[PDB]
């Protein structure tokens, strides 16, 4: 299962034996982001705006803690866009799924998020964020052509293109009327 | 008069070429942006394995 969340994300659970369980979108006290971890400190300090205390020395007894098997997991490239356009917690793969089945799963859905006359700049900015890891040269270009339609002047070019997009059916109609005149006017020159 | 008649002709040609280029620039942008989106969808995605040691920053 995948689900979209708000940035910044911070979760710190104090454990009973005196360690702390941390999952956080940003670094603090040398703890890596995005991967969770069990954290212990030798001297009281403030991390993620709260106090992580040094635990009381304990006596060792025979353990019964479980040790689960490790597991690599491959996710779809655009998992973030799939989770965002559902607005609920959604199933994205299985532990033991093939590359082919995994891909043919949100492909039709994703293809039909096509370019529109009404949010071309907002679309072009998604395409860049999607392309950045694949082709960084193209991303930087797309991002540029994004900010040109949005920012340059008062966004007048964005406006102009948006409007010329919505007019398409009228233009064809006129274009057709011109041909029907031109053909007649031409045929009415030949002897 | 001849200069004004010539100017009108030359203006119309540059005005025609101006549009026929804009038609070609927009058409090429729509084709390339839509293909790249298709390729973005089918790329291999990230891998996660819960290894902390791997993500250490010094």
């Amino acid at each position: 299962w995948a689900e979209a969340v708000k940035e910044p994300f911070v979760q710190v659970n104090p454990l009973k034996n005196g360690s702390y369980l941390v999952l956080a979108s940003s670094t603090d006290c040398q703890i890596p982001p995005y991967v969770p971890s069990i954290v212990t400190v030798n001297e009281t300090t403030s991390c993620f705006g709260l106090d992580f205390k040094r635990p009381l020395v304990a006596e060792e007894r025979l353990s019964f803690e479980p040790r689960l098997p490790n597991l690599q997991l491959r996710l779809p490239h655009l998992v973030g866009i799939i989770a965002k356009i559902k607005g609920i917690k959604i199933e994205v793969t299985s532990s033991g799924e093939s590359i082919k089945e995994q891909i043919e799963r949100a492909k039709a859905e994703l293809l039909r998020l096509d370019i529109h006359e009404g949010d071309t700049p907002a679309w072009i900015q998604q395409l860049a964020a999607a392309t950045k890891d694949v082709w960084p040269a193209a991303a930087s270009a797309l991002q540029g052509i994004g900010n040109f339609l949005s920012g340059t002047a008062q966004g007048i070019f964005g406006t102009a293109f948006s409007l010329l997009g919505y007019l398409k059916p009228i233009l064809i109609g006129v274009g057709v009327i011109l041909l029907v005149i031109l053909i007649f006017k031409i045929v009415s020159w030949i002897p | 008069y001849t200069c004004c008649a010539t100017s009108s002709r030359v203006l119309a040609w540059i005005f025609l070429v101006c549009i026929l280029l804009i038609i070609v620039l927009v058409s090429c942008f729509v084709t390339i942006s839509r293909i790249q989106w298709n390729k973005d969808i089918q790329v291999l995605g990230p891998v996660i394995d819960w290894n902390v040691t791997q993500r250490a920053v010094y």
């Binding site: 369980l21 006290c29 040398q30 703890i31 890596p32 991967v35 969770p36 971890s37 069990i38 954290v39 212990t40 400190v41 030798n42 001297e43 300090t45 040790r67 689960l68 098997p69 490790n70 597991l71 | 819960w50 290894n51 902390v52 040691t53």
Partner: peptide, 23 residues
């Protein structure tokens, strides 16, 4: 007269371990 505050080094040890499968 000139009062100043010089920084002086120090450190706190921080151990970290993994949680297979996030369980």
């Amino acid at each position: 007269s000139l009062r100043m505050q010089h920084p002086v080094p120090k450190y706190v040890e921080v151990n970290m371990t993994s949680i297979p499968q996030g369980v």
